[PDB]
Automatic annotation (TrEMBL), chains A, B:
Name of the protein: NAD-dependent epimerase/dehydratase domain-containing protein
Annotated ranges, domain NAD-dependent epimerase/dehydratase: 7-216
PANTHER family: NAD(P)-BINDING DOMAIN-CONTAINING PROTEIN-RELATED (PTHR48079:SF6), PROTEIN YEEZ (PTHR48079)
Pfam family, one: Epimerase
Length: 302, 302
């Protein structure tokens, strides 16, 4: 297995599937993990494991030795505080190839309402926007900034990732909320959903094939929240969540005083397809069913 | 003016009206304030002002000298942290008569759904309830605990206080939210509303006349939130806020994850009436109009 690729955050949903994709390609897999993390869930991949706390420049450098590449999986300041040492260590370890996993919320909304693409940038500080968007904009700026400064950083930006192995769960709380009768309503909104297994392969592909300093949207299905809500319901044998007005959402925010909860957009997958060879082939139902089954076997449904 | 009564928190809505009531009764008024507070808004009452930070036992003791009585106007721990020194200082200053301003949220809901009364107690820690209720239950327990231990504490519990001189505003954000088009919806609920001017007189009356260690509900009008919402709208020349389901409120709380906002009850005013001679005589519209006018003259409406 002539090539060695590492993954930080391998126990998260999207990292676990990057790790798998590296194993599926027949590369040597390295997993850089914090000592507290339960990386033995990935022992089946026969990984090489390197311990490193993410604020420990001696240990990151050491964990980043002899790699052909690496995937990376008070709110703004400390987001930047975690990534900054990593980039530091990548420079010292002389890693040739770095992919940083970004978010589509680093991008503004397509100004004609069409599906979003990699060319959508905020000219400067996304002022007046949520702190979520701000944090996501910063991490995006930071990565490009390392590219500009001669670091080999590629940026891979998946849509909402859904699939099996979602421990929290995280993104798949939609599935469990619905299944457990909790999500009784939804708010209108556009969203791109992507199968976890694929998003992992897309990451590997950006890492091996992306242009340094470029973003690549890794997309699945463009979807109304009504329809994502409804399909999951139908599959779980449950009633469809009913729509809830946008005004009725702010009116609760206002009762509070005494959002980006449906601020997503559709994504254009062409760049990844033409440059990376990447695109989804999995039916959405197959993804939603595989997630559903994983959650059920592990008792996330009451 | 043979009797001297003091008020802490005189710049708040309910304290300002206690202060006024003390002036209206022809007593000598003392205002105990923190040095940062803008107590010169009450200079027209020709008050005697005593400076005291509320965590400064030397200064409270000194500010509590030679009084015939006093009205008192991480969330639980620090609520108790503010009151505890005050009670300490009342013991050393030998104040004969102390009224603590409580909340109706220290009481559980009438177990047959009738209007609530002073006999409603939680037998012990109000477990599983909101931290708001918990904090309000504690301060209530604390006051009774000082009574039990020989301190002359009376507890006065007004309903939702509405009227003029509401600086934040605080309770009157309902009025301004509606007026400014912000409160577009409300959640079903029962509530007791009381005129500010009166609630101040009720406080004075509890202080002079209550039994040591007893609670006294100071009540105005029992009101559906639909009707309070609607009257304020009609008076402001605005559309009535529309009802919003309770389920639709939790369904937003649940979208968040990826209350007591209508948990109030009606209050029974009989104890205050029979013992204190207290009861409301003011039409609700007159109260809502006086508040409305105060807010308007000071430019709280856009």
């Amino acid at each position: 297995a002539h090539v060695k690729y590492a993954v930080l955050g391998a126990t998260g949903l999207l990292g676990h599937h990057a790790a798998r994709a590296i194993r599926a390609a027949g590369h040597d897999l390295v997993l850089i993990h914090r000592p507290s993390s339960q990386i033995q869930r990935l022992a089946y991949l026969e990984p090489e494991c390197r311990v490193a706390e993410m604020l420990d420049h001696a240990g990151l450098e050491r964990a980043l030795r002899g790699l052909d590449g690496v995937i990376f999986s008070e709110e703004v300041a400390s987001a930047l505080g975690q990534t900054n040492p990593f980039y530091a260590a990548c420079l010292q370890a002389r890693v040739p190839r770095i992919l940083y996993v970004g978010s589509a919320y680093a991008m503004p909304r397509h100004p004609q309402g069409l599906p979003g693409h990699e060319g959508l940038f905020y000219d400067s500080l996304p002022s007046g926007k949520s702190s979520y968007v701000l944090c996501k904009w910063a991490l995006d700026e930071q990565a490009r900034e390392q590219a500009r400064n001669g670091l080999p950083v590629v940026i891979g930006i998946p849509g909402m990732v859904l699939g099996e192995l979602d421990i929290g769960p995280t993104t798949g709380r939609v599935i469990t909320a619905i299944g457990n009768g909790e999500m009784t309503h939804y708010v209108a909104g556009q969203r791109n959903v992507i199968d976890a297994a694929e998003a992992g392969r897309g990451l590997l592909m950006a890492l091996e094939r992306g242009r340094i300093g470029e973003r690549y949207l890794l997309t699945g299905h463009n979807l109304e929240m009504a329809d994502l809500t409804r399909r999951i319901a139908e599959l779980l044998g449950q009633p469809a969540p009913q729509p809830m007005s946008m005004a009725m959402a702010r009116a609760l925010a206002t009762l509070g005083r005494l959002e980006v909860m449906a601020g997503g957009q559709f994504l254009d997958g062409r760049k990844a397809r033409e440059e990376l060879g990447f695109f989804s082939t999995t039916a959405l139902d197959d993804t939603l069913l595989r997630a559903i089954d994983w959650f059920r076997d592990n008792g996330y449904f009451n």
